[PDB]
Design a protein around this ligand. Structure first.
Ligand SMILES: *CC(=O)Cn1nnc(-c2ccccc2)c1COC(=O)NCc1ccccc1
Ligand SMILES: *CC(=O)Cn1nnc(-c2ccccc2)c1COC(=O)NCc1ccccc1
Lengths: 213, 213
């Protein structure tokens, strides 16, 4: 009964795509805007709840199509909550596409928090992203996540790899609070279609990913 | 700090509509089929988990448009889980339509478990119903639920009122398991449209209900 499930999980995805006009004008975030900002690491939480910090952003890099980010989900307290819920979900028990090994925790995160949202203050794991192309790809190896993204070049991958190889438990929230933001996710209009769309956009598929959408 | 929130909640809705052909042929359940069955009360649980019994069905009655049911959510352990999660959800904090008093718990249940599903073995509270018209209406008074359903007649309401006026905590599941079936609900195709549809069908609206869809 070795628990090699509550070990770190990495997540990567585009925080913003330079080929996609927002739905609202307020989401517009251009290349020049973003690169000025790339100039003390910044945290990773759930649905913008500062009480629900689960890890940190390990590397961001602006590339041709947008702003890529790759975080680490390190919080023991959070990963353990995730582990207990995934034992209880039918979507997880159906497992990934045959070739991929079953990873109950990586799948659960893949299902629940399928999007990325940049507010830099911090990065959040949403149910979906508000901005298109914000697909969140979870995995046990930092190099595994990055390689799902075709638009990323070898040289791109090397800029990231330099960063992710460059104080207690930061998760003060709990099962009841994640339960709380789960029903909120149910009422996001066209959640799946939006997600199926980001999948086609950044080039990821489920026969190469734990993406559940 | 009086907790008049973890008190009983009632839920009513059509288990099956006699004017709606199923999507699959296997859901067909006709009037004659149902009335033979009306001939020891039957339990009410969450997503067909027998470990997650939250109460019981207090009255069923076949009427012109279908099979109406009205249950009671009595489980202290479950209602308390629901109370803690609703404090943590943005949809609940936005409250019902102005006239309706805020009821964090009744709203949370309204959002999470918006559908009814009959498997009689037992009735389940789903995210959505598989059968159309299975809209689950939650409320603090048994008579309040019934009166949201226009198709129900006075005489219909009197048949029910006779039944709902006619052993420990039955919830052995917990926060982690409801968390588990929450992400499963996210991947039900056209969840909202299906729900907005049942709303129009059985005649309920949100300006008269805690329905969040
Ligand atoms: C990642 C975020 O910034 C949070 N978020 N993700 N998707 C949405 C959203 C909500 C409505 C319509 C489209 C997208 C959000 C917004 O979060 C909020 O501040 N509002 C809370 C809320 C969310 C869903 C339903 C009702 C209220
Ligand atoms: C009330 C129920 O009987 C459970 N339920 N509610 N909606 C669905 C459903 C699932 C897929 C497509 C349409 C409707 C279900 C079915 O529950 C299951 O047995 N399958 C588990 C599951 C649910 C959602 C997504 C993936 C797997």
């Amino acid at each position: 009964q070795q628990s090699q499930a509550v070990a770190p999980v990495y997540v990567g995805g585009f925080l913003a795509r330079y080929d996609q006009s927002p739905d609202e004008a307020e989401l517009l975030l251009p290349r020049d805007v973003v690169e000025h900002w790339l100039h003390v690491a910044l945290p990773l939480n759930i649905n913008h709840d500062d009480t629900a910090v689960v890890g940190h952003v390990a590397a961001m890099q602006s590339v041709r199509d947008g702003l890529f980010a790759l975080g680490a989900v390190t919080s023991p307290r959070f990963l353990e909550i995730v582990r207990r819920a995934s034992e209880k979900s039918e979507l997880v028990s159906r497992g990934p596409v045959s070739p991929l090994q079953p990873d109950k925790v990586v799948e659960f995160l893949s299902g629940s928090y399928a999007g990325l949202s940049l507010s830099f203050k911090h990065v959040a794991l949403c149910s979906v992203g508000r901005r298109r192309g914000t697909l969140a790809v979870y995995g046990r190896d930092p190099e595994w996540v990055t390689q799902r993204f075709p638009d990323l070049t070898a040289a791109d991958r090397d800029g990231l790899r330099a960063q992710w190889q460059r104080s207690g438990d930061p998760f003060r929230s709990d099962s009841y609070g994640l339960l709380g933001n789960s029903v909120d996710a149910l009422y996001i209009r066209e959640r799946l279609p939006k997600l199926r769309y980001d999948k086609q956009l950044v080039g990821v598929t489920e026969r190469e990913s734990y993406v559940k959408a």
